[PDB]
């Protein structure tokens with residue numbers, strides 16, 4: 275309790291605002307703002323469904339809720355905890371189309387396209403997960419899986435070497451697009467501040483890239499190499515690693531849709 279409970283409140287209280295204040299307000303019905311709503315829905319579902327159950331799992335060091343719960347609790351965690359990354363990847367593509375190609379931003383980014391990004395971000399991130407935890411492709415060698423995971427108790431979704439690389443590659447692509455489309459923007463926003471005569475572009479892009487890298491990267495990096503160098507990593511030093519991505523999902527509605535003044539201005543008209 276304590277720290278873990280606070281992260282659950284933020285992931286729902288700080289996220290309910292974004293999903294409530296888009297549907298009700300017709301001033302914010304822009305196609306780019308519907309992607310933020312879908313991202314908010316995914317983060318809210320993380321906060322309501324997977325986080326409370328994983329809270330007790332990390333404080334009792336055992337899966338009290340049977341085995342079906344586990345066979346199920348893991349798969350959707352991997353499913354729509356990795357669906358938060360695709361939304362960031364697509365928001366990056368948004369910014370890139372807005373800035374690099376400014377003449378045709380409303381032409382290419384209609385609602386029809388922002389509706390095709392949500393379906394991809396929601397269905398693809400799920401069909402690959404549910405085909406790994408249930409079908410049994412997650413573990414090609416189960417003899418080592420049983421001793422470390424089942425007999426002691428608890429669930430940590432260990433991955434074998436052949437398939438752990440695939441897990442990594444569904445974080446590399448959501449990350450390679452984010453940095454490549456923010457490296458170019460940093461330069462473009464640099465040459466245009468010198469043209470007027472920079473300070474703000476570096477600060478804004480820094481936060482939008484450090485928040486993602488400081489949370490998702492450390493956990494996945496330690497989770498991809500643990501299928502090669504045996505499993506020397508202690509189980510107790512893994513709870514913080516799984517909670518980092520939960521932390522990231524709590525701050526998301528704060529870096530996006532909260533750091534911009536066009537949203538605070540529209541939401542300040544409550545009274």
Ligand SMILES: [NH3+]CCc1ccccc1
Pocket residue numbers: 351352353355356441516519520
């Ligand atoms: N919080 C863990 C979510 C997760 C775990 C492993 C692969 C992809 C996503």
